[PDB]
Design a protein around this ligand. Structure first.
Ligand SMILES: [Mg+2]
Ligand code: NA
Lengths: 421, 402
């Protein structure tokens, strides 16, 4: 059974909603600035891509705001937006056939740090004081509440779960939902991801391994994937949600088919928890398998939404994987990293990337890799630097890499191409 | 056909399958006061601790610095499961081996210490391992790297329902083309913050008598007792298994299913009954075929009543033996489902139903046939395993005798 996307919802830095989101990407401008959620002075990487979010304006009541972590607020806001755009009639829906697959790398990191200060008296006590125990503490300890929150918003009663595979969560959560619908475990799925990691503990853990950029003097150009002067990714927050359903059913109801997820696959490094080999062997195989399921030849790929975190090892890593899987076609296919503009929102980024591909497939414009000014010999492909590029897209590829060794890839094609499949 | 060829258990009442199975059949629990820190200053004080596990004796000195207690237990469990199945990762195609685990708390002990150093000393004191020792995917990635498994892998989070969901997720993967999949879960949150966090659940027993604190389905039920540990098991394609030379297994994972309860206030019925019937259909087996039900065993009155009611609706009141061996270990979150599965397979293999400890009086209201005291020798061939996760997660799994 085939799965398609009928609705999209996005909450990215400088992109509240698909319109603004797309306006930002095609404009090539960035949303990476100096961190304002707290004082970055004590840390190495003091820049991040922060999303302008107003919970009250989104429609959350007092209990919901006091209850849910920032990441769940983003997820739910996106699920609602996707539900709305899908046009899927709530009344005709059978809750027992509606599921949820939410991805998240660090989940409630923000609420944990907030509560940690009250419990420990700002790090003074190991034996925390239960007198300052939040009534929601358990739900920050065990993030399961995130998928639940979304399920309650959309009326889901089918398979509901959280996929947490590091920086590939955004892709694996959608892939999981695709498998759910294909296997017949659900007819409608609300899938996507969200992460709100801009918090001291996360920044400090990335500084420890120097994974993030130390370029604090020029925040607007801090994220520079594939660039010769790159020195790490830029920490970001964000979320995106999609409405997925049976292909025939979406056609039958006359829904708008934003795209068909014709292929998805994931494999592991079995190499190192954060390190990567230059060969890109595993990712190549992942792309091969995804293409195999999709039945689409490598030469059909019209664009590749890269991982492109901006770290030395990563960018060079996937470049090798592309040439290994796409062969010569790798050199004659546009590749670009939206992280150059929205930063790396960890588990959320994969979903934002899927949303970006869907938007590209429709508008026929390939988003550029901003800040790409100095070329790197190890990254000798075409990364569409600085300016967007007009191009007819029918079949696109998107991949991601995450701590733990995870390598995932997904193939997205438009309705036109799907109907011809 | 997906078989369970190898199991690895790390439980509060037994480090390893043999010790565990022995304690279960004998009703010995591994419950007691928390000694990881001073619990006398908190409302809840009892937990299922594993006290005979010294990481350095099971984990390579290289991994000790970067692993949380939960991960060390998972790696130990995983290794034992692979050799129990006589499976050599080095002798198998890397891409033909996957890893699917569930994780509820992640490396919380580890992250708590990193939070303290950050605000006590400063960001420069944060460990270079904090970046991957805490996140929920940690146990999948570490198991993957240690055994050179490169096939499709994942990590799921759904509180105590996750462990069963992980197993079902593995079944899906195997059926799509990956011959072997390591699956399971292990949790541990026995640090002051993790402890206080669990207490915030509002469902933790404040009893002081270890023999009478976790009493699912008992009229004196007053909350569950937290525990640390779990299980990892090796699942694989029937054909690939026999071809591998592995003709011996624990059982078959016949069917799986996950549902989610309606939002709070909807008044609509829970989805546990639906999950059960979905799992039975997937397995191609009817209610009458089930010989034993390993209940979630919430230990919280309102939840026990809900569960007893769903079981009754499917198999009829007192219509099928019900048991809750976790009374001997406590709730292990992502480890609970996996351990229940192991306990069920052992019951099928040994021809006896693992008994429930502690419970002495089951309310007529629940209408269930609970196995208490001694193991009941009914020689079951099909078992149903149930697990629920906080906020409404339901998970059911049907197993068959090999
Ligand atoms: Mg990508
Ligand atoms: Na013990």
């Amino acid at each position: 059974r085939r799965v398609v996307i009928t609705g999209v919802g996005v909450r990215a830095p400088g992109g509240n909603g698909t319109r603004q989101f797309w306006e930002l990407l095609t404009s090539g401008r960035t949303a990476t600035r100096r961190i304002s959620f707290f004082d970055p002075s004590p840390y190495r990487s003091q820049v991040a891509a922060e999303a302008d979010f107003d919970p009250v304006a989104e429609g959350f009541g007092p209990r919901e705001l006091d209850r849910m972590d920032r990441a769940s607020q983003f997820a739910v806001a996106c699920a609602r937006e996707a539900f709305a755009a899908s046009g899927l009639d709530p009344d005709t829906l059978d809750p027992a056939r509606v599921g949820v697959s939410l991805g998240s790398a660090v989940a409630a990191a923000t609420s944990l740090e907030r509560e940690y200060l009250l419990l420990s008296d700002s790090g003074r006590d190991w034996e925390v004081d239960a007198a300052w125990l939040s009534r929601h503490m358990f739900d920050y300890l065990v993030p399961s509440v995130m998928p639940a929150e979304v399920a309650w918003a959309v009326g889901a009663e089918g398979p509901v779960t959280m996929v947490s595979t590091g920086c590939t969560s955004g892709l694996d959560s959608v892939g999981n939902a695709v498998r759910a619908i294909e296997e017949g475990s659900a007819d409608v799925m609300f899938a996507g991801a969200a992460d709100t990691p801009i918090t001291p503990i996360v920044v400090a853990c990335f500084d420890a391994i120097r994974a993030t950029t130390a370029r604090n003097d020029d925040p607007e150009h801090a994220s520079r994937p594939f660039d010769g002067t790159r020195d790490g990714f830029v920490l970001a927050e964000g979320a995106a949600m999609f409405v997925l359903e049976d292909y025939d059913s979406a056609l039958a109801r006359g829904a708008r088919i934003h795209a068909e997820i014709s292929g998805y696959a994931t494999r592991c490094n079995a190499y190192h928890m954060t390190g990567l080999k230059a060969d890109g062997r595993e990712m190549a195989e992942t792309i091969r398998v995804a293409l195999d399921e999709s039945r689409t030849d490598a030469t059909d790929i019209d664009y590749i939404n890269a991982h492109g975190s901006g770290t030395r090892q990563n960018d060079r890593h996937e470049t090798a994987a592309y040439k290994r899987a796409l062969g010569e076609h790798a050199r004659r296919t546009p590749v670009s990293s939206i992280k150059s503009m929205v930063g790396h929102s960890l588990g959320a980024i994969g979903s934002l990337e899927i949303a970006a591909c869907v938007l590209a497939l429709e508008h026929g414009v390939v988003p550029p890799t901003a800040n790409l000014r100095t070329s790197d010999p190890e990254c000798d492909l075409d990364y569409v630097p600085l300016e967007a590029r007009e191009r007819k897209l029918r079949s696109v590829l998107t991949v991601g890499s995450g701590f733990g060794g995870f390598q995932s890839a997904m193939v997205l094609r438009d309705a036109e191409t799907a109907g011809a499949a | 056909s997906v078989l369970i060829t190898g199991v690895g258990v790390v439980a509060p009442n037994g480090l390893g399958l043999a010790p565990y199975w022995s304690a279960v059949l004998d009703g010995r629990h591994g419950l007691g006061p928390v000694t990881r820190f001073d619990v006398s200053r908190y409302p809840a004080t009892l937990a299922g601790q594993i006290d005979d596990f010294h990481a350095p004796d099971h984990i390579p000195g290289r991994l000790l610095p970067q692993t949380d207690p939960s991960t060390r237990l998972a790696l130990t469990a995983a290794d034992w499961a692979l050799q129990d199945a006589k499976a050599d990762p080095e002798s198998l195609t890397d891409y033909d081996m996957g890893v699917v685990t569930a994780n509820a708390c992640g490396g919380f002990d580890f992250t708590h210490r990193e939070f303290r150093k950050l605000w006590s000393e400063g960001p420069k004191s944060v460990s270079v391992y904090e970046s991957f020792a805490w996140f929920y995917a940690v146990n999948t990635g570490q198991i993957s790297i240690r055994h050179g498994m490169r096939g499709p892998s994942s990590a799921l989070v759904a509180e105590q329902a996750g462990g069963l969901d992980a197993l079902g997720h593995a079944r899906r993967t195997i059926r799509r083309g990956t011959p072997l999949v390591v699956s399971g879960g292990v949790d541990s949150a026995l640090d002051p913050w993790g402890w206080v966090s669990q207490i915030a659940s509002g469902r933790i027993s404040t009893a002081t008598d270890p023999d009478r604190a976790y009493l699912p389905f008992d009229e004196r039920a007053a909350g569950y007792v937290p525990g640390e540990g779990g299980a990892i098991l090796v699942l694989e394609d029937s054909a690939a298994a026999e071809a591998r030379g592995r003709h011996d297994a624990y059982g078959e994972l016949a069917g799986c299913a996950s549902t989610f309860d309606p939002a709070p206030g909807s008044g609509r019925p829970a989805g546990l009954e639906r999950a059960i019937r979905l799992a039975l259909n997937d397995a191609g087996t009817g209610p009458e075929d089930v010989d034993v039900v390993f209940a979630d065993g919430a230990g919280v009155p309102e939840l026990d009543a809900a569960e007893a009611r769903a079981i009754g609706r499917v198999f009829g009141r007192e219509g099928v033996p019900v048991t809750v061996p976790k009374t001997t270990t406590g709730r292990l979150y992502s480890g609970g489902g996996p351990l229940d599965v192991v306990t069920a397979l052992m019951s099928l293999r040994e021809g006896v139903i693992a008994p429930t400890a502690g419970v002495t009086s089951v309310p007529r209201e629940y209408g269930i046939d609970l196995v208490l005291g001694e193991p009941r020798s009914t020689a079951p061939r099909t078992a149903l395993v149930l697990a629920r996760g906080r906020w409404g997660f339901n998970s059911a799994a049907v197993l068959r005798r090999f």
